[model samples]
Target chain A: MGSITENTSWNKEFSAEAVNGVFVLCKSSSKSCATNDLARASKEYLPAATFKIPNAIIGLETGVIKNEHQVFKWDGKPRAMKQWERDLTLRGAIQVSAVPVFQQIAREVGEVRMQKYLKKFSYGNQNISGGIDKFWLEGQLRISAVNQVEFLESLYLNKLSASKENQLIVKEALVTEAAPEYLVHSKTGFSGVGTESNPGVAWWVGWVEKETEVYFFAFNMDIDNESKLPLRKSIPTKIMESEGII
Target chain B: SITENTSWNKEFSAEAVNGVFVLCKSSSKSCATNDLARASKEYLPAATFKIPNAIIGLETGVIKNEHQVFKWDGKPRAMKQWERDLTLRGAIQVSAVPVFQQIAREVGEVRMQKYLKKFSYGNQNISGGIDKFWLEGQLRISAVNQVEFLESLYLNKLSASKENQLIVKEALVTEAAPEYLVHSKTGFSGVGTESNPGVAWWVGWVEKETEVYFFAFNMDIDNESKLPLRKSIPTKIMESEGII
Candidate 1:
């Protein structure tokens, strides 16, 4: 059994940044957990770009993307991010957050295979009817911060149904930072600032490996403006630092 | 990325045993296996615990080095091979239980629990007794976890120090050839009562040219003579797969 303790003290960290959010960190060995907000941590929201972790895995497993070095050539169309307009390798596409490249991959993967794998992965609500390519972005796939940590833990252990090699490939793409003492694998996602009827959610989720132990984390905040975006990572960085994890 | 090699089922049938074999290639991220269902099933680790037991000893400094000798008391052992004084390398070769039982007693319950948790070995259970936990205790590990554990050890990626990892890896070498090298360990938990069939295991990796393949095989042993199939069966599969 694992213990889940509330750390209301993190409220100051969120208030300092003028944002409302939740944080969850779980120790893999002990199965113990630490969190700032238990309520919202279990509340579901669109995975947004955080879906890229599983997207890359499904892509590789289905042969939609051949390998890590497989390249998806940009059509030279102007896009939101200037980095998205060139020929990009798999890692290159992930590094630049090339939305168009992944959309193309999803389109090729189609609905049947996509739905099957998501069902197998127990991803979100298993709803991709929004559209083959737009489901995770503007559609029905929603996952909570706690579920994100569970998914990442499975990915880390190669326990998901996918091949070990393909899981390893996606994990390699997730490398945020690596050092002698620790390695960090993470992904960030944003569901955009919404109108009165809808509220936007920004997310930062991943895990840290210190020696043989692993610490998984998921942070999600309500954001109405781009200015509050940096808090997604900065807040978690400070929390992990205070815990001497970094 | 994972394909089931159903054709190999005859090998198991031929031996009149039930088992599973899993082989993984690092380069292609491909895995081929027979009986994926059984491959994921958990069983007591048996003597395969020696692999981690050896590593934990080095890490805890209970056993100083590979050459440190474990003087055998002039008492009768279950097998003649275990009756004489042996070093860390020698004990592992014969799968001597008393040497490791002594090592386990030195490792104690608390330290053993900590290392097993850190290594993520099986269920991390050592409840019965420190020396005999992996043998008859609640400890259990599946073939899949076995391969993953060995893969981490081969990569020197375990939370252990690199020097100690290499020392254990060097000691695991059981076969050497000009073109390929084999490092493995075999284990037998024994044929149990009619209610529970015993489990036999052979888990390790193969190094050929620039590639490394990790494998684990375990079978239901109803007869003691069927024990050697633990290694022979996997070796045959490896040969057919062009892995050895």
Candidate 2:
């Protein structure tokens, strides 16, 4: 069938995704290695900065900004954070997961064009009720672990409905690790209060591509302390290694 | 035909001890039926069926592939240790009834009925519903039949896929030795529901690369202490016969 999940494995019994098969860690390819439990947690999430991965594509595709090298001058202004103080190229904005720079790109892309892209992506709950800039971060827009896997699945297959050049640029910028045998590509997102009881959804969604195959994964869970945040990245990295995919 | 007293007579001559052991390559009639042969009668399989259910879950795609983690609902279970997200392997190792029950619901009636007919488990009535079938009613199996089925499984002759059966075999392989590998699933049956499951069970196969032996036991356990006989008795029985 035309599905996007491969085989899912577990060396341990439970994961952070499911409290009792409630949360889930899912991976996908031409086939799915998933469970009914992951499907149960299929409700959308804010997706936080991980949206920047796709937003980068929308930015490049819409011509709202030029190439990855094109720069947006800061004009010596203060940003929401000290790290975001200077002007950034599209490449720089993506590296820091800079929210402000993306907001400008959204402004340039505008609501009409942004809505058009979200529709095209069939992004989760594509409501965007909070406006273009903050929709994926804090507004009505969100995606689920399953949906996130699908988004990455399409991107890895170069079938995400974006131009080859746009996909190429985004993939080049999103490479988190590269070696002779394989390439690890990913973007992470999390938004909620930091604490065990008041945990936000922590996500590590990405893919590891060898010479011939690409294994994409969506590792997500409700986490409390920010200290627990690195797990989102490290866990999947370990799993991929265990599966011998990377 | 009288096959002497019993190949396992030296293992134990106790009247209360009952079990059936089958070796795949041995002539169908070679392994002698003994004093406990009638005692090898019938009982509710209880959690032992989780092994078969796992196979059905995989074959039907109800399980959603390998190592699909399931968090415990934590409602109320007779077994307290069974609360956590366990994959098919963990759930099987822990005998998580709730996990199997959940899988039964997902497999639904049509598939269960179909598989039961295919596996030819008990009377295979399943007239009650998904959860009710193996609990009581006509769902009974003799050790004789259990061994036969297990032998079929060993020979890769079951109706389910070879991969699914292999997955189950892998899960059941609890111990590995330089000489042999052992695979088994244990079950205790009694009252909580309508069935009086005073019977205890131990069913599995022992394997050397060159040969295989299958065993199934269903003996009465009048109280808690007698429970160990299900395993301990059959264990010594296997070793005494030089099958282990």
Candidate 3:
């Protein structure tokens, strides 16, 4: 479980599109496993907003702070957050690999309780435990996998209740230069030992088809040890170009 | 807290000679506001043993037929004239020690074991919890649990449909003793508490003269509380002989 920042160059291109969340799948041949390490290091320095998505959901369910409507003043700036924005912030937090929030939620609610609800909601477990250490790793994995898929699914289902301008802002923020029409929603994170087992890459990519109103995509390799950049655009392009968006 | 008329003084004498339990009671008044204290200052310390003796006699058929002999050390021992000539009645009528010890000895190991098991005795200790390592302490402190065990045994004996049940019932009901049926037993264990130190006194008495078969009462009093002295004060004033 690792995370990639929402402000990464690739994220900038995706943000340019009408995508609320964009999943990016990439491979690196850095045998030193720098990919996950890089993600972890980046997450360590990210702000609380990065982890807001999962935290908001957990807070909502547990009546911890209540829904995103009870706006929080972060860094002396007051912000009113809608559920989706909170979710996005949580996704970002996952991207940045914030651990404290993740662990706090899990500990208060218990792993079993969260697992029960997650399973009930059809969310896959990814075989992750809930705790400080696992929180960061699995948080990254979940944001990259299910969170990205779910974001795309929400858009495909027209679930966003935000104003047109806000929606546009999200879309513009996610579009990456690598793909134009591809509405991407994803996150990546990494963790491991020193440089040798250092950077690992966990990435996801999914798109919504407006014609059939369906969502589909693929998650890139979840690598433990980093290798060379396994950049292959043909497979995703071919899959995206498919007729049904399966 | 002493008022003249309510205040009392008392003296008690208890002895077991030739295995015959006896108690002599005498009392003077005292002004104890509490009902228990007042009662204790004026009564005989009814030695606890009479109840079990009656029950065992009844179960062994000794009560129904006087000629029936009770074996002690494999020697046939005829019912003592005190028991035979005595009418087993209630706790207030007879001293408790003799009856209780007699039953313990006569009920025999097999029957005692059965009775104990039927009561679910010895199973009350809690094995684990916040005090998992302190299980022994828990058991030691669990007096109520032990009482529950006794209660179960009492109920089983009361309801037992076996042939011996009738005999035991008769022994408890025999009013050959003076005032009470003497249907219960008394036991004392040398365990005490820190603040009010005393041995554990287990007193079980039955009121057999009542409309019901018998009324059972069990009380455990700590010695440090002066329970024996307290218990004797009342029995002295109430007994026919006015103290042993």
Summarize candidate 2's per-residue lDDT along B1-244 as a digit string, tens digits: 2133356544444645434443333423443444544533666776677876888898899886543667776687767667656655567777777788878999998998898889877666676558756655456777666776777666557898665665565456555443455678888776233444366788887754335677766666556676777777778777766767
Model 1, B37-143: lDDT tens digits are 88778998988999999999988999986446788889999998788877565677778999999999998898999999999998998988888989998999988
lDDT of 3 at A63: 57
TM-score-better candidate, 2 vs 3: 2
DockQ of each: 0.02, 0.01, 0.00
Quick one: best TM-score, which candidate? 1
Which segments of model 1 are wrong by more than 4 Å? Answer: B1-244
Task: Quote the true-contact fraction of every model.
Answer: 0.00, 0.00, 0.00
Question: How would you order the candidates by DockQ, starting with the best?
Answer: 1, 2, 3
Q: Which number leads on lDDT?
A: 1
Cα lDDT tens digits, model 3, B26-135, are 11111221123222221111232233334445555445532233323433333332242222332213332333345445565556445434434343232233112011
- Quote each prediction's TM-score: 0.52, 0.47, 0.26
Query: What is the Å distance of residue A232 in model 1 from its true position?
Result: 0.5
**Candidate 2 whole-model C-alpha lDDT, 0 to 1:** 0.66
Docking class of 1: incorrect
Best candidate, DockQ-wise? 1
lDDT of 3 by residue, A92-206 (tens): 3333344444555556666666555444333333333545335544343343343444444443333444322222222322222211112233332333312454434434344
User: Would candidate 2 be rated incorrect, acceptable, medium or high by CAPRI criteria?
Assistant: incorrect
